[PDB]
Amino acid sequence: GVHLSSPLASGAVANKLCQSFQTFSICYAETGLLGAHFVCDRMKIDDMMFVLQGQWMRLCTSATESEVARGKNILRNALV
Amino acid sequence: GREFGNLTRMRHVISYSLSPFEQRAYPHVFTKGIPNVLRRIRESFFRVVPQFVVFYLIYTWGTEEFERSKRKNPAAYENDK
């Protein structure tokens, strides 16, 4: 849906910012790499960075229980 | 032409930078900074300084000549008698 998705994906199509994006956590024996990865049109890089950082900040606080519950179900399904 | 999105068309260039928190704010400010300033000063010393020296010479002479004029004239009183 246009706005029927995770908040970042809903923003990905409200002004047609992203063409695709993904999140990753590449763990190593002693370290790792959290972060995100996305493709951009030439004139939309700034907006995607702004939205992405906003979501990370919004997760560092203002974390509703319902959103966490959805994440846990996704993790269970994906893991199995 | 006025937006960062579209200003020029470049290709085949790479850049490397470090975070502000990962480096010193005054790196080699004793062994590499001072000599660079000395290079800057020396490279443009003769292009500026000498002209302003002429100004100083013109300024000193002027003042000297001005005061020299107010001195009384012994040649205007020798015959006055």
Six token digits for residue B9: 């068309």
Between the alpha carbon of residue B73 and those of residues A63, B18, B69, the distances in Å are 99, 77, 9
Under a CB-based contact definition with an 8 Å cutoff, are residues A44 and A17 in contact?
Answer: yes
Under a CB-based contact definition with an 8 Å cutoff, are residues A38 and A29 in contact?
Answer: no
The nearest CA of chain B is from the CA of A75 a distance in Å of 34
The resolution of the experimental structure, rounded to one decimal in Å, is: 2.5
Quick one: A44 exposed, middle or buried, by C-beta within 10 A (0-12, 13-18, 19+)?
A: middle
Query: In the A/B pair of chains, how many CB contacts fall below 8 A?
Result: 7
Residue A40 is inside which H or E element, if any? Answer: strand A32-40
Q: What is the 3-state secondary structure of chain B?
A: CCECCECCCCCCCCCCCCCHHHCCCCCCCCCCHHHHHHHHHHHCCCCCHHHHHHHHHHHHHHHHHHHHHHCCCHHHCCCCC
Does residue A4 sit at the B interface (CB-CB below 8 Å)? no
Does residue A37 sit at the B interface (CB-CB below 8 Å)? no
Q: Residue B23 and residue B18: Cα distance in Å, rounded?
A: 7
Six token digits for residue A18: 């992203």
- Find where tokens 């409200």 sit: A14
- In single-letter form, the type of residue at position A23 comes to T
Q: Residue A71 and residue A8: Cα distance in Å, rounded?
A: 14
Between the alpha carbon of residue B31 and those of residues B18, B25, B38, B44, the distances in Å are 22, 15, 12, 22
Q: Residue B3 and residue B11: Cα distance in Å, rounded?
A: 19
The nearest CA of chain B is from the CA of A68 a distance in Å of 33
Under a CB-based contact definition with an 8 Å cutoff, are residues A71 and A57 in contact?
Answer: no
Q: Is A34 helix (H, G, I), strand (E, B) or coil?
A: strand
Contacts of A42 in chain B (CB under 8 A): 5-6
The nearest CA of chain B is from the CA of A76 a distance in Å of 38
Under a CB-based contact definition with an 8 Å cutoff, are residues A53 and A45 in contact?
Answer: no
Q: Is A55 helix (H, G, I), strand (E, B) or coil?
A: helix
User: What was the experiment behind these coordinates?
Assistant: cryo-EM
Does residue A42 sit at the B interface (CB-CB below 8 Å)? yes
Residue A39: closest CA among A11, A18, A14 = A18
Q: Residue B31 and residue B37: Cα distance in Å, rounded?
A: 11
CB proximity under 8 Å: A 49-78 to B: none
